[PDB]
């Protein structure tokens, strides 16, 4: 099971060449790996499955999203100037609208890798649709020998839980699995395809790439840096002149000498 | 079992990019790992469980909290100036109230990771509510064949202790477990979700972020640095002039020469 | 199974000598390895195979292609100046046609390694043509003992799925496999041969290598570098003169002194 | 068993950020690990246990304490000036009392980690109170079938020694253990809690933190450094002028030439 | 199986001392290792073998050859000036003939290591001549008990495929193998001997080592370096004077000020 | 089997202190290790052995010898000036005879380590003299019960091939082996002794150590270095003045401007 995460492990061990997305690589690479040690096991009960599996395609994604906004050091400047009234805003809506949108496209790198990499291994999908398999399809001389609706859902639904499987009635194990891990791995490619193709279009066309506001932004965020870095200079400077008055008082103020004079 | 902690192990091995929270990463990453080598095993007795399990969601958290306050080098300055009377305080309540509050939000990074990572593996929860499972639910032709209340609590309660399990009466093992590790992993996400969302709000709104007092603080804590660093200069300086009087006395004072003169 | 990817692992660990193709080595080396942890298992059903196997020779290639264009920092400049009308284009079609073509030949290094390295191991090919093997050829006293067409496709088609194989009727297992992994490894060489030989011709002849436009290009792309790098200078410069007016106001504006004066 | 010590192993491997306590980390981290390779096995005899177990909560702690005082380079200066008569002491009792007390709180970091980490694994506690377990409690249809007092102590007392356990009479093995490793791990938390909370109070209040004597101390210990470092200068200086008289005598004193002159 | 390639692995890990051949060591060392992970398994059918084995002594060699020419940065200069007409060639045939020949003797280091290291392990040779072994030689009381020609080729030919071997008729397994891995390892030495001895003669005698043309060559290839390296200087220089006119326009052109003036 | 080569592996990993022999350590250390992965297995047939074993004490040595001459960068200078006529030789026979002899004593470090390290493990010797063992010596109640000459050579000769050994007739296995690995390891020491002792004599006496010609040599080989290193200076110098005439033509020659002028 180490394969899905040990890969980025040496890849992390490989080099130190990246960007903000590589800074996102600090987190989401763990998201490529955090799946590995976090186990998965479904109740194999009659109706809980379709509830439970939807838990592991919506919450842990949404967590990794919101942990992207708070993680970067900008939201206050947008949060601060939004709550204030219009007019008083020292920034145009344009620089707001852009700079707000350039937070999403750096956050979305985690919650798409953690929807691929829990489809390609199918576990998330297996416990979610096993209740409705066409049992007549490849059923070893099938025909549903008088089987009812209840007490068959409790027959099908165990399929992922291996050692507690009921038996050969209208199914083997290795044909009900290994046919739901096929359909799953079809979505996993026909999903990641559509997303990356939609990564094309975005850059390639447009949405708030105006040469005007891009300039004002990068100027501004560059300006906050020099402000913080420079304020410390005046403090340490202005403080240095102030310590000399007091520290000297400790000297010449205990005994004006040492008793250890030989 | 190495997975839960070997992950941060290479992640620790990964790089050296962090902050005070990464300084908290020095500790709490161990808290992500300290769970790994510290075993867990419940008494599997009739009433001790619900006592014992609450031991491992309140004490070891609270320890990691208080080890956060004492660990950082500020509490004296707050502790010193609080015990003194008002008026004599060389600092406003504002700089107190802020600087005191900026100790919590750096300490709380340990005691939330050690409440998630002992819910997602369910062991802490399993030995805490096994005494009340609905045995009729998925009970293999159930009906409670005349079973009493006592001598059934001692029947259910063994469920986590594997090799000492009684038997198939109104239960298998792999259906009483693997249904309490489902409910547990639901809290683990619906908890970590709520917390991180509440990490949003805090930064995003406010609570003592006033531009006034933030300034006075960082100036002040910057000032203590130069004071300590500069005091050593005068000492080593003032001492250097003093050693010359005595060290010379050792010379010219033993024999004023060596007998080894050839 | 680590062999196919652990090789580039130490090879990655080997040194840091490469180029843009070695920059492509950042990705496609993973493509040499990403096959390793991504499992493969075919439905072993009557007609799905020839559908499913074609999934793993066209989609995951095409993904690695489009992830090559978006990955490099040029497509905007081509995308921007293409949507505009002719005439307004500040660049000749020649520099366009070349610079556009020099994106393909840096992208095609991934989608040819991931068509070799899923033929040489034959798994992709095995589940794709097992339905039509000449069963009379090496069939252990063959003759098709009255076997029909249906209920034989479901007999042949299981061949890759080992533990669920039907039996010795007109076949053993280790002669239906180990004869489709021969034919496969013949394409894998007679393919990679043809491609590399076609890598010869390209460089060796020509296609838009004109000394004129190559010059204008590398000049231009060199020019964008100095523009971005130099703009930051004026900002940090022009900003530095501006901070001094405000930062001084914080000083001399809180109390014009400290109450901690002893 | 490597877990309890392999953790600090990579943690030691982690970084090199610490202080005098981290210098104590040089030793006590081994004390976190020295437990690992030093085995434990109790006599499983009738009365020796309660003797023997008390051996491994008092001696190996007390050793790690005294190895803390001697390890640091100060005790002579306190030991030297204590044996002398009062009055002649070149230092006030205050600087003595403080500087003596600042040896304990750097030594106590070892003998509290080696009392936690041999309670949380319970082995030290198991062989110490097995002689008195309430056998009627969870005793598999108990009632003490005429069992005497002697020849039952020799029945209970074997409980930790696994392969030499007598048998099922009024006990199984996995219920007499796994109920004494519960009670133990309760002290281990309710102990480490109380200690760390008492680490709060100490810093937070007081005990010889007077601004007067703290100054004189750190000045003094700073002074011993420059004295030792500077004495070597005069020696190597004063010696250099002295060697020239003799070393020249070796030259011009063997033959005033070489016979190898060609 | 790691031995054949893990050797160069630490040898690669050993040091970084080599030349263009060591640059070829970048590739062919993989060719010493690429054999390791690329499996081998022959059809064990009547006539395909002698076809199939010849596949793995001619194609994968020839690939590693052509990947040597394209890999080095010279073929264009030869390819460019060859297609042109004679007379216009700015270079003598001598510098052509030499410089063209000094491409082969740097490429031939891969396709001789991959013909040795797939003879010394004999697998390539075993599946190629098993159809004609003298069965009477060491045949355990032989005599060919009426065996025909067909239905014996299908008897011999299975010999490499271990678990599907027919049986003891006129052969054991461990005497038909372990006599074709002897004859093979004889060629492997009597081949590598002849080649290295022919490496002697080449250097030691001659073939286009003329002092005249060697000079003109190394001068020329040295000249292309300074040309490329120096062209970038004029560009970045000539561009720097050009950016100042436009970048200033962005300034003073948005608002000529900031609205954030307090 | 890793022991014979894993030793030099960490020894190689040990340090980087050596000379030309250590440069030979680059190769022959592999020769100490190349034995490890190159298998050995003898035909166990009646007469081929004494042929085959002599293959692995003469060819692979002789290869490592000739790979020593060609490997070092001197043979041309000797090869060039030997083919020429006497008189024209710019070097005395003395400097020739010495410099030629100082190639052997740097090459002979490989072909003596690969004759020791395939005697001390005896495999090379076992398959070479098993055909003539005194079977009466330690033969478990021997006497040769009417055994003929043929059909006994095929009885003895299998001895190294373990699983195909015939049986107990006049021999066990573990007494025919483990008496030919004794005699072998006697030569291995009484050989390496004689060689190293002959390494004494050589240095210690003489053979072309004349102070005259040693001087002329090391001067000469020192001179070739400065010649090659210095020639590149004039080229890059003389070329730099030449590029400026042409590179400027590319500028001012495409359009004398850019159309992108805004
Ligand atoms: C070994 C691992 C195993 C993997 C297994 C399988 C893997 C399959 C994985 C496939 C990877 C899929 C790629 C997506 C990348 C995420 C986004 C991102 O990173 O930023 C990109 C934005 O691109 C997007 O905007 C994509 C988000 C789509 C949602 C858009 C929301 C709006 C539409 C919603 C509807 C209304 C832009 O990146 P950049 O800023 O241009 O910087 C790139 C250059 N640099 C990095 C060199 C600096
Ligand atoms: C591989 C591991 C496996 C993980 C598995 C599962 C993981 C699930 C884990 C999920 C992580 C949850 C995130 C919480 C972070 C803790 C707090 C913290 O760090 O500081 C944050 C405060 O944020 C808070 O204040 C949170 C504390 C909530 C309690 C608030 C008490 C008041 C309300 C009580 C009611 C009255 C602020 O951080 P920062 O100062 O802004 O610095 C950030 C930037 N930097 C780091 C780049 C510098
Ligand atoms: C251990 C791993 C296991 C491997 C197992 C088996 C391996 C088998 C693998 C064999 C490798 C095959 C080599 C192909 C290389 C891909 C292209 C490429 O990299 O760029 C090359 C272009 O070469 C091409 O153009 C090739 C693409 C062919 C399609 C052409 C499309 C047009 C025709 C479609 C019909 C209409 C050029 O490269 P370069 O720019 O000149 O830089 C080279 C120099 N440098 C790198 C030193 C800087
Ligand atoms: C992976 C490992 C597994 C762990 C598993 C379980 C672990 C459980 C472990 C829990 C750790 C418990 C913490 C105690 C620390 C020991 C003392 C110490 O270090 O110095 C502290 C003193 O603190 C004390 O004084 C404590 C000693 C109490 C006895 C007091 C004797 C007087 C009362 C007796 C009655 C009369 C002060 O430290 P500092 O000088 O302020 O420097 C700190 C800052 N720095 C380090 C950043 C520089
Ligand atoms: C651990 C691994 C396991 C190994 C297992 C078994 C191993 C067995 C392996 C044995 C190795 C065999 C050695 C051959 C070397 C290949 C060629 C080469 O490298 O260049 C050499 C040319 O030498 C040749 O020309 C050889 C090619 C022969 C074909 C000639 C074609 C013309 C005749 C066709 C008929 C018409 C010259 O090299 P160099 O330029 O002088 O540089 C050397 C110095 N330097 C490297 C220090 C810088
Ligand atoms: C872990 C490994 C396992 C080992 C297992 C068992 C190991 C057993 C191994 C034992 C090692 C045997 C030592 C021999 C060394 C080979 C020669 C050599 O290196 O050069 C030496 C020449 O010495 C010779 O000349 C020896 C060759 C003898 C043949 C002479 C041919 C002429 C006579 C034929 C009849 C007519 C001289 O060396 P050097 O130039 O003076 O430099 C030395 C100093 N330095 C290295 C510090 C710089």
From Swiss-Prot, chains A, B, C, D, E, F:
Disulfide bonds join 42-127, 44-161. This is Calcium homeostasis modulator protein 1. It is found in: Cell membrane; Endoplasmic reticulum membrane; Basolateral cell membrane. One of its GO terms (cellular component) is plasma membrane raft. Residues 63-70, 105-117, 192-202 are annotated as: Phospholipid-binding. It is a multi-pass membrane protein. The gene is CALHM1. The keyword Calcium applies. Residues 10-37 are annotated as: Central pore. The record marks 74 as: Not glycosylated. Pore-forming subunit of gustatory voltage-gated ion channels required for sensory perception of sweet, bitter and umami tastes. With CALHM3 forms a fast-activating voltage-gated ATP-release channel in type II taste bud cells, ATP acting as a neurotransmitter to activate afferent neural gustatory pathways. Acts both as a voltage-gated and calcium-activated ion channel: mediates neuronal excitability in response to membrane depolarization and low extracellular Ca(2+) concentration. It catalyses: ATP(in) = ATP(out); Ca(2+)(in) = Ca(2+)(out); Mg(2+)(in) = Mg(2+)(out); Na(+)(in) = Na(+)(out). N-glycosylated. Assembly with CALHM3 is associated with N-glycan remodeling and formation of hybrid complex- and high mannose-type glycochains. This N-glycan processing regulates channel trafficking and gating kinetics.
